[PDB]
Each structure stands twice: as structure tokens, then as C-alpha cells.
């Protein structure tokens, strides 16, 4: 009586501790190369920001009007998105983005500032609604008449909630030192801000910038997180963009950046710009910046795991 093992005409080559390209009976892949070029979002509350930039949801340019109080498990940023209508930017912007990406969405709350002896309805052709408008959640505070002085004002807001309040204000940098005076009067304009946690202050910087949206003025956007029962004071004398509403975070979410479509027919937890990595495999060679719950990124294109014995044909 004779015994033996099976074999095949064509084996699969694998690598071992000692040998390179030994043929085994059967093998199976261990590195995922297959991408699905869509954002598989089946079962998830998804918000596709489109033209609305993430940071814009807090301030309110027209493109963000339908996103002022969104709610999501999954937040998608798009290259076409913009945080701004009137030219400007956020100081410490990416920190804020990371916060908003996992906020699970936002909830808005009037801070209840009232004004006495100034203007309040600043607008621009960059923010198009009716006609000229402004940031929905903000207020452009002027001086009552086409020149004037600005009264050193002091507003305060207490966070009456059990969660930290996202406070955002703005600083306006006019084209000229002339323009600055036509809006808030002459002089050195000062904005000071404090909490039980925060210590800072701001002065404007009038001067000509490149024309963006048609304008050479800019707006500095600044932000801080007010802890429960802590209070924020705004000491200022012009060039000030005031928060109307404060923001509160809803819970928990994931934020990605993508150029592909949403698909509610496929499910996945591993996302990158080009789509979704659906896989059971422990590794992937698709995108090292993939986020969510992913197989480990590796450099190798392929790593075959032996699922059978050495293949020995006659």
C-alpha cells in the first residue's frame, strides 16, 4: 500500500522565512487593492457640504444657509466648498475643522447681544441673498453715521448649557486707514476677550490686499470654546464682527474629504478621497491617509498567504 498527498498542474507562488517564490497548492491575498469609487454611506446620517465650507456652517455665508444647524454621523467636505463670502479666513482654522468633523453636527443659540448707539446692519455684494447681505450668524457693527465715533462697548455671554459653547467673532481689516474711520471713526481700535480659560486681544490692520470676490478688505475670524457656566467678555471699539448665535455640538461623527459620489446602496467604515475601502483583509495598499476603521496601510502591493501544502507535481 502506498500513500501520498495531492498536487496541481499550476500552483501559486508564495514567500516563506527561508524561500522566495515557493509554489503551494492554494493561496489567498492579504492586501486590499480594490477600491469602490463612491462614499458608501448606507445606514448613516450623511451631510454632503457641497459648496458650503465646514467653517462656514458656524458663521453663515449664503452657500451655508441650509447647513446652519445640521446633524450627521458622516460629514463630507468638497473641494468646491468655501468658508467665506466676504474675503477673510479663520485663525487656527484646522483645529476648528477637526472639532466640527466629529461634532455630530451643530445646534445654534442666540447669545442675546443688544446694541445702543451704533449701527448693526452691515452688508456687501460678496454676500448675495435678497441683494447685498452678510454672514447669517454674524453682525457687522458700524458707527451710526458715515463717519462718527465708536463707543467702547462691553457685551458678555454666559454659557447656560452643560456643553461647551463655540464662540466666533470677526475682525475687519479695511482697504484704507480712511475706510476704517468711515466705518468706526479715527484712532487705534482695540478688541479684548477673556474667559476663565482665555486671554487675548486684537487690533485691526487696514491696508490694500489683493482683490478677492471683488474686494481688497479682509475679515479675521477668531473662535474660542466657552465651558459650561463660564462667561465671555467682549471689550471693543470698532472693526468688530459680532457673534449673533453661539454653536453647540450635537454628539459624534466622522468627517472626510472626497471628490466622489455618495451611495446609500453600499456600506463601509473605511473612507478616503477616492471612495470606500470595503474589505476583510488586514492590510491595504490604496491610501495611507484613509480614515475610519481600516485595514492597516502597507507599501506592498501584494502578500500571498498559503492556504495549502507545497505543490509537488511529478
Amino acid at each position: 500500500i502506498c500513500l501520498g498527498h495531492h498536487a496541481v498542474s499550476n500552483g501559486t507562488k508564495v514567500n516563506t522565512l527561508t524561500e522566495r517564490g515557493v509554489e503551494v497548492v492554494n493561496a489567498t491575498e492579504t492586501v486590499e487593492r480594490t477600491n469602490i469609487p463612491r462614499i458608501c454611506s448606507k445606514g448613516k446620517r450623511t451631510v454632503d457640504l457641497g459648496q458650503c465650507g465646514l467653517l462656514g456652517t458656524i458663521t453663515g455665508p449664503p452657500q451655508c444657509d441650509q447647513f446652519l444647524e445640521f446633524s450627521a454621523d458622516l460629514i463630507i467636505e468638497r473641494r468646491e466648498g468655501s468658508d467665506v463670502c466676504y474675503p477673510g479666513k479663520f485663525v487656527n482654522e484646522e483645529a476648528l475643522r477637526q472639532i466640527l468633523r466629529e461634532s455630530g453636527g451643530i445646534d445654534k443659540e442666540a447669545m442675546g447681544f443688544t446694541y445702543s448707539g451704533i449701527r448693526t446692519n452691515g452688508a456687501t455684494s460678496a454676500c448675495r441673498r435678497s441683494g447685498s447681505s452678510f454672514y447669517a450668524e454674524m453682525k457687522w457693527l458700524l458707527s451710526n453715521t458715515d463717519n462718527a465715533a465708536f463707543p467702547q462697548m462691553t457685551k458678555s455671554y454666559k454659557n447656560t448649557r452643560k456643553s461647551p459653547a463655540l464662540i466666533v467673532w470677526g475682525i475687519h481689516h479695511s482697504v484704507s486707514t480712511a475706510e476704517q474711520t468711515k466705518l468706526y471713526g479715527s484712532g487705534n481700535k482695540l478688541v479684548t476677550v477673556g474667559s476663565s480659560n482665555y486671554q487675548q486681544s486684537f487690533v485691526p490692520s487696514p491696508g490694500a490686499r489683493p482683490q478677492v470676490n471683488g474686494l481688497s478688505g479682509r475679515i479675521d475670524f477668531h473662535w474660542l470654546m466657552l465651558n459650561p457656566n463660564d462667561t465671555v467678555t467682549f471689550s471693543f471699539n470698532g472693526a468688530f464682527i459680532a457673534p449673533d448665535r453661539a454653536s453647540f455640538l450635537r454628539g459624534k461623527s466622522m468627517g472626510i474629504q472626497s471628490g466622489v459620489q455618495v451611495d446609500a446602496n453600499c456600506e463601509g467604515d473605511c473612507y478616503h478621497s477616492g471612495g470606500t475601502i470595503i474589505s476583510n483583509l488586514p492590510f491595504q495598499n490604496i491610501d495611507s491617509r484613509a480614515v475610519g476603521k481600516c485595514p492597516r496601510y502597507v507599501k506592498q502591493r501584494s502578500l500571498l498567504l498559503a492556504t495549502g501544502m507545497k505543490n509537488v507535481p511529478e
Partner: peptide, 10 residues
């Protein structure tokens, strides 16, 4: 889970 610490648009 891992999140972005990077930015591909800005």
C-alpha cells in the same frame, strides 16, 4: 477609528 489630522484641500 482614526480621523484626519491632515488636509488635502488646504
Amino acid at each position: 477609528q482614526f480621523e484626519l489630522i491632515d488636509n488635502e484641500f488646504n
